[PDB]
Amino acid sequence: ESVKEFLAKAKEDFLKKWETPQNTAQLDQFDRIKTLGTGSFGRVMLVKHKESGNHYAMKILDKQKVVKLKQIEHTLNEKRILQAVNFPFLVKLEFSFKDNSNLYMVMEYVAGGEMFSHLRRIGRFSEPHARFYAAQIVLTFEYLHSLDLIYRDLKPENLLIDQQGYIQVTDFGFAKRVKGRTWTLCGTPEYLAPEIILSKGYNKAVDWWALGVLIYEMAAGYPPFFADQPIQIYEKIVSGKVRFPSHFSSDLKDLLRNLLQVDLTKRFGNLKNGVNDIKNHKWFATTDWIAIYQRKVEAPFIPKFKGPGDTSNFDDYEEEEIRVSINEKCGKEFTEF
């Protein structure tokens, strides 16, 4: 099969860079321009390389809070996986480094903004529009899962739209090389698979569940399981109960029932034929999978930008001084970064 040979070469490329793991830039070299997004352990900023003039997105992670919160291996996973993967819908890592206080991952800047903000503004995507983004996610998961990688935080906020309207997956914070089961409670509440909530030990099937939530939210405008308190969200997820907007196509409802299948014996993507059950589903019958990979399909929506470093597609955030200590912090814990 063409696909199988492709994946096998992708694995070879990956394992080589997987053993390439240092300090390929320094903070000194970048003007920090604007915060693009804030998170629990730091922020992502638009920066500009002062000498070349290129713009990038720099994720800053505070080493101390990372250590305090038992996130060292996650943080090492994030950077190691991001540098070794290579796929048209995965954001590029251009530099990474560390200092006395922080870890830094300098990515290509995807100026289109979060899928989340366009989705909330438009309200909901049409089924062809949703299908265009989903197809790219299906191929990306087939690729990552082929290298024994689980992604574990699919949601609109982690999907960026590029200048051609295609998807760039960012935020590899929970990505992990996994053959077999893993056990860490992580992800985003509205998107967690039931086996994660129930602490049963899980595998790549949790990514196919998240795809079903993603497709549901893209098409409906809201996710299938949400409530005021996350305990209520988890009760819904675990219940095996999903109501569909009447405006959903019957094909869309059938695909969602098979991805939002709480029984792993039945969840699409986890059966004998693997990802092919999703690719072959009637909801995708009009999808040219090779054309999507080659990025030859005309996107349904292209964000507008006014030159490089434009940030109009991002919310505004409270800025703050980047705290870098006079003393090295947590040196031993991050030697491999």
Binding site: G37, S40, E114, R120, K155, T184, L185, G187, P189, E190
Partner: peptide
């Protein structure tokens, strides 16, 4: 403008 409340990841 429409509300747009981003959802943060969660750990243990």
């Amino acid at each position: 403008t429409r509300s747009a409340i981003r959802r943060a990841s969660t750990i243990e």
